[PDB]
């Protein structure tokens, strides 16, 4: 399949080169997979989700996304126009309040929730979790992320936006998950992107168009935007049978575009997520 005039990040993840505008992907499109978006919620009523999104948990007075961040991330995973995996099932877990804040005990509860809740869902092709959030290092947050991964979920986490070593942030610093840095449309490391040995992969993260609350769209930037490209890519590859939740981060790194990015500090991987789709 070919989507013309796609957002640049979608075009990038199906290309060996920067500077193109068509997203190429197998029509299976993540059908039969599931992605949990652990964030501020998802506006499931957005036409872009086509009935494939739903809220499954909140820790606040409402499950509504009053912020937008979670809706945007979900759109990059799986919206019809803006998403990588256009037929995946999207499940929202609101661990962050409408101000974007979440206590670590709530984030941990939400990760343990997903590890259990997947057993209540139909995801024959596999399960992914996208965590575009974090804070300072916490062993308990990292352990929660490690348990979620161990339970059979492909966990993708944002590296953070401090232009610093991700080793000092959580869940970014948990080794066993897939820690995602951000790039821009000219194949530069995004200026804000964290880096370091704990990064597994980069994805598009600067000036990413996606869904927003109120049935709208907008372009924003962050490692938060890179993470759902990788989460969506994992769901897509799982549907194709190319990998599994335990192996997807390795598979994505194995099959990535190598050496394309600039301003990658010495000791950080130079790997950009790539679907290797050949019509």
């Amino acid at each position: 399949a070919a989507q013309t005039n796609a957002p640049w990040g979608l075009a990038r993840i199906s290309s060996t080169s920067p500077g193109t505008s068509t997203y190429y992907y197998d029509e299976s499109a993540g059908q039969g997979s599931c992605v949990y978006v652990i964030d501020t919620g998802i506006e499931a009523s957005h036409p872009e989700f086509e009935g494939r999104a739903q809220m499954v948990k909140t820790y606040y007075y409402s499950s509504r996304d009053g912020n937008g961040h979670g809706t945007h991330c979900a759109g990059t995973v799986g919206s019809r126009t803006y998403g990588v995996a256009k037929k995946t099932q999207l499940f929202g877990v609101k661990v962050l309040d409408d101000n974007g804040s979440g206590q670590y005990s709530t984030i941990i509860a939400g990760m343990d929730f997903v590890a259990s809740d997947k057993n209540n869902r139909n995801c024959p092709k596999g399960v992914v979790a996208s965590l575009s959030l974090g804070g300072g290092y916490s062993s308990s947050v990292n352990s929660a992320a490690a348990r979620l991964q161990s339970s059979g979920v492909m966990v993708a986490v944002a590296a953070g936006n401090n232009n610093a070593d991700a080793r000092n942030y959580s869940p970014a610093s948990e080794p066993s998950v897939c820690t995602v840095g951000a790039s821009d449309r000219y194949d530069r490391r995004s200026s804000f992107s964290n880096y370091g040995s704990v990064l597994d992969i980069f994805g598009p993260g600067t000036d990413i168009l996606s869904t927003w609350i109120g049935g709208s769209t907008r372009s924003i930037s962050g490692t938060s935007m890179a993470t759902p490209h990788v989460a969506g890519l994992a769901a897509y590859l799982m549907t194709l049978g190319k990998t599994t939740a335990a192996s997807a981060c390795r598979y994505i790194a194995d099959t990535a575009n190598k050496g394309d990015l600039s301003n990658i500090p010495f000791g950080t991987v130079n790997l950009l997520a790539y679907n290797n789709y050949q019509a």
């Binding site: 979670g70 962050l96 974007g100 979440g102 206590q103 984030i107 959030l133 974090g134 938060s224």
Partner: peptide, 4 residues
């Protein structure tokens, strides 16, 4: 935490 905060959103990224």
């Amino acid at each position: 935490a905060a959103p990224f």
